[PDB]
Design a binder for this molecule. Structure first.
Ligand SMILES: [Mg+2]
Ligand SMILES: [Mg+2]
Ligand SMILES: [Mg+2]
Ligand SMILES: [Mg+2]
Ligand SMILES: [Mg+2]
Ligand SMILES: [Mg+2]
Ligand SMILES: [Mg+2]
Ligand SMILES: [Mg+2]
Ligand SMILES: [Mg+2]
Ligand SMILES: [Mg+2]
Ligand SMILES: [Mg+2]
Ligand SMILES: [Mg+2]
Ligand SMILES: [Mg+2]
Ligand SMILES: [Mg+2]
Ligand SMILES: [Mg+2]
Ligand SMILES: [Mg+2]
Ligand SMILES: [Mg+2]
Lengths: 116, 251, 229
RNA sequence: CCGACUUUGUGAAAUGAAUUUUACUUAUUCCGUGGGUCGGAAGCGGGGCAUGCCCCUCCUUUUGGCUCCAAGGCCCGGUCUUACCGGGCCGAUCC
RNA sequence: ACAGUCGACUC
RNA sequence: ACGGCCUGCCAACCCUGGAAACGGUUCAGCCGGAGGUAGGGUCCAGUGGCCGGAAGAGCACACGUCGCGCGGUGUCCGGUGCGCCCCCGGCGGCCCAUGAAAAUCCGGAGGACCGAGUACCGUUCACGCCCGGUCGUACUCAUAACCGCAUCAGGUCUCCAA
RNA sequence: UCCUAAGGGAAGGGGUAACCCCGGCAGAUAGCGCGAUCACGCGCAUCCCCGAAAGGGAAUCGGGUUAAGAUUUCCCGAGCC
């Protein structure tokens, strides 16, 4: 030997190869677009957001994150978000401010879904 | 009664050692081949004040004998050491104040400090500020030596026990009156929670064997036996005598 | 050429750093290795009683190899070959209905079976492994073979016995009968083995083994006796 | 605190018909390392006033520097076969 | 060592 | 804010040079043949000056238009201090007390191993492209949103301060 | 959020009738890491996690704005990691 300390040797391990899958059925997507985008909040304070700042205010599933919000806002409504802000409103649900890239018009989307 | 302060100190609750700013264990080097059978050259880098200990500590930066790195060891400064000094460790270290030699290499009469006791336990006697052990005599038929400790006792130690030649620095420190409860307090914060210390005679019986009474007095012999159960062994333990020490008994 | 040069490093006690040499003496082993080393060391230091010290006295290599040649000649039956012997008698039972087998002769093994053979005195040669753990399984076969007058040897390697029979250990073997074509070869080995153990038991039943102190302790011994003498 | 039994083995003498003393290392107990040099025998010098055959030594004292991942030497073995790769050892005393 | 300008404060 | 340039405090550092008839300097110290006074340089702080940011912003006035209009002018110049707040620099003092650790970052020692020049190996440089997730965020912070059975003279840690 | 301090919980081990109790006791230590895979070599020290919205700390400023939000979260501009 060289050193006065015996460190444990290197052995080799195999990856798990089950003879039966533990979970057969393929797991469905449960935070899908329709759960993740519940309904656009339509207060007058948000109606002002629709026309001043080119933003749509949605109420989103509480376990949402900004990446999923932008992805769903794209698949639904066939737009994109240049930036999303989120906050969990004190009553309990999460509220998301989805600002559209100024290619798309928030008025146009608000009348394609019926808000204003 | 209730459990008495002499008994409460063994719990560790608040009586642990206040060691947040202490610089680490102050001890010799791990005895190895080179320092069994030759000398190793190390250089002092700083004399650092160790909190809670009167003796300064000397950072000594050896070169590692068999790996490529420095070894910041940390000694108890012997009065005389200075930064930039070369201290040499081993058996063929020249008898110079600061070098550490086995006692097989300290001529009789020489003063030493930080004496090991089992060869390689890295220094146990003559360590506090300004104390030293004199190598009285040697016996080469058993490979042992004798030293006069600070206490006035005389201990046979293995002849291969190392020792730092000189005396520990910081000597004469306990000569200065502290003059202030403030000085006493700032002394004991950095050692341990053992001050202020209340007379037992001014306690109630439930917490001290001396307690209570319409006058303050002990009421029974203040000398207690060696075997007295914990909580009774307070006072003067197993005393051979008392009163002011006169004559031969004061030796 | 001219630049090629010698640079001696001075591997002193304060010289340059020593190289990658051997430190095998000092390596801090796992606790398993550590304990299995002080195991044999402590068996060396302690005084083995004669019943256990009749071991450590094994067959010598030459006679062991001569014996194991015959043992290999008489190996027990393979799993591969034991299906064929039961497969091909099917027809001899189905059509002829008559058995033409003669006795197949091979070595016997297994502690219970060999003690059965020995205690009926049907055992014509016994071969005991020296290193059976727990030792008590064979502390007594030497004495048993000795007081029933059966030739025995304490060979070395229970695994090497196991190979003979195709098991991982064997711990004991014995021969009851050999082919007529090798009686003389057999009886040349029996007399030697008898001479080694069934002639020396009655004086190695008294000798305590062990006590062979350490290397440094023996160096102390030779240092001390000289300064005494 | 103390005695006996127990873990608790090995062998030696002295007193008595068991007692205090001792020596061993392996149980045990304490200590130390990143289990880093142990034990023995060599060899390099130096003391020689029986050339003994024994002792004292292990190529660092030096000025707050640096020191690692070996140069080197021989022997294998492949390679262009008319130009280049893999190793055995010594350096680093042997058991 | 004189001349020009300035100066908020203290005694 | 941020980017560039300039300055360069009090300390520290470099070069020439050689000091007694001792000098230099502080409110105080202190410094000097281990190299002062002197001449000349470097670096460091900056919450310092100028420019970009930037007048288009903000304020202030002045008008005149019905309807987050629009138009115009200014957004200057010095001097002060035992002055108060925040910070920084560097001295001096006190200690039987010497007054935290680590993440993260930077720097250095050594130099194994590496490549072209009709072209290939790097480049901690400049500019360029993309992305930046989860949770808190309102309000009181008290002679009424906190605790004391209260919308209780009680108690409860701070920052700003004419 | 990240880091550690006082200090806390813990794998192996030791105790405990069991709940629970001990963390330096040193055990092939919990984590292996680094160049490398077109693989392998080298090192393994004192070796897990938690612990501060007053300690350490990647980076932001000005002007607007709402009935109630933002000083720097929104808006315009200019940046930075
Ligand atoms: Mg948020
Ligand atoms: Mg107190
Ligand atoms: Mg007192
Ligand atoms: Mg008192
Ligand atoms: Mg009282
Ligand atoms: Mg009492
Ligand atoms: Mg009393
Ligand atoms: Mg009285
Ligand atoms: Mg100058
Ligand atoms: Mg500035
Ligand atoms: Mg100071
Ligand atoms: Mg807010
Ligand atoms: Mg607020
Ligand atoms: Mg209540
Ligand atoms: Mg944490
Ligand atoms: Mg924090
Ligand atoms: Mg903080």
């Amino acid at each position: 030997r060289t050193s006065v300390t015996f460190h444990r040797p290197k052995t080799l391990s195999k990856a798990r190869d089950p003879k039966y899958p533990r979970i057969s059925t393929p797991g469905r997507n449960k935070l899908d677009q329709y759960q993740i985008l519940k309904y656009p909040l339509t207060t007058e304070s948000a109606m002002k957001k629709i026309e001043d700042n080119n933003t749509l205010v949605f109420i989103v599933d509480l376990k949402a994150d900004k990446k999923k919000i932008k992805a769903a806002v794209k698949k639904m409504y066939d737009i994109q978000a240049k930036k999303v802000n989120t906050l969990i409103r004190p009553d309990g649900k999460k509220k998301a401010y989805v600002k559209l890239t100024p290619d798309y018009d928030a008025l146009d989307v608000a009348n394609k879904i019926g808000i204003i | 009664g209730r459990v008495i302060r002499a008994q409460r100190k063994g719990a560790g609750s608040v009586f642990k050692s206040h060691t947040h700013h202490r610089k680490g264990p102050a001890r010799f080097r791990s005895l190895d081949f080179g320092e069994r059978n030759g000398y190793l050259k190390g250089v002092v880098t700083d004399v650092i004040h160790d909190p809670g200990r009167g003796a300064p500590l000397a950072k000594v930066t050896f070169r590692h004998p068999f790996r490529y790195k420095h070894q910041k060891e940390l000694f108890v400064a012997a009065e005389g050491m200075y930064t930039g000094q070369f201290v040499y460790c081993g058996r063929r270290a020249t008898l110079s104040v600061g070098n550490v030699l086995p006692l097989r290499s300290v001529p009789e009469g020489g003063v030493i400090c930080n004496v090991e006791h089992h060869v390689g336990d890295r220094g146990v006697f003559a360590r506090a500020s300004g104390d030293y052990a004199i190598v009285i005599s040697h016996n080469p038929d058993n490979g042992t030596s004798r030293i006069k400790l600070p206490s006035g006792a005389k201990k046979i130690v293995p002849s291969s026990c190392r020792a730092m030649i000189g005396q520990v620095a910081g000597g004469g420190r306990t000569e200065k009156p502290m003059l202030k409860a403030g000085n006493a307090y700032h002394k004991y914060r950095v050692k341990r929670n053992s001050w202020p210390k209340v007379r037992g005679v001014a306690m109630n019986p439930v917490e001290h064997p001396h307690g209570g009474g319409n006058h303050q007095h002990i009421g029974h012999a203040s000398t207690v036996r060696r075997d007295a159960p914990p909580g009774q062994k307070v006072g003067l333990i197993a005393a051979r005598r008392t009163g002011r020490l006169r004559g031969q008994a004061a030796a | 050429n001219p630049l090629f040069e010698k640079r001696p490093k001075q591997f002193g006690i304060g010289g340059a750093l020593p190289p990658k040499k051997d430190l095998h003496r000092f390596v801090k082993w796992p606790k398993v290795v550590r304990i299995q080393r002080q195991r044999r060391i402590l068996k060396q230091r302690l005084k083995v009683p004669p019943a256990l010290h009749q071991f450590t006295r094994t067959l010598d290599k030459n006679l062991a190899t001569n014996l194991f040649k015959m043992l290999l000649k008489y190996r027990p039956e393979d799993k591969a070959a034991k299906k064929e012997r039961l497969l091909k008698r099917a027809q001899a039972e189905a059509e002829g209905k008559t058995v033409e087998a003669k006795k197949p002769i091979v070595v016997k093994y297994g502690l219970n079976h060999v003690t059965y053979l020995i205690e009926q005195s049907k055992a014509q040669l016994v071969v005991i492994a020296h290193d059976v753990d727990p030792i008590e399984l064979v502390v007594w076969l030497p004495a048993l073979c000795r007081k029933m007058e059966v030739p025995y040897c304490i060979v070395k390697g229970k695994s090497r016995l196991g190979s003979i029979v195709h098991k991982k250990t064997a711990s004991v073997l014995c021969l009851t009968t050999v082919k007529n074509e090798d009686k003389l070869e057999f009886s040349k080995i029996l007399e030697a083995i008898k001479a080694n153990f069934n002639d020396k038991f009655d004086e190695v039943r008294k000798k305590w083994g062990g006590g062979v102190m350490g290397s440094k302790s023996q160096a102390k011994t030779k240092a001390r006796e000289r300064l005494i003498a």
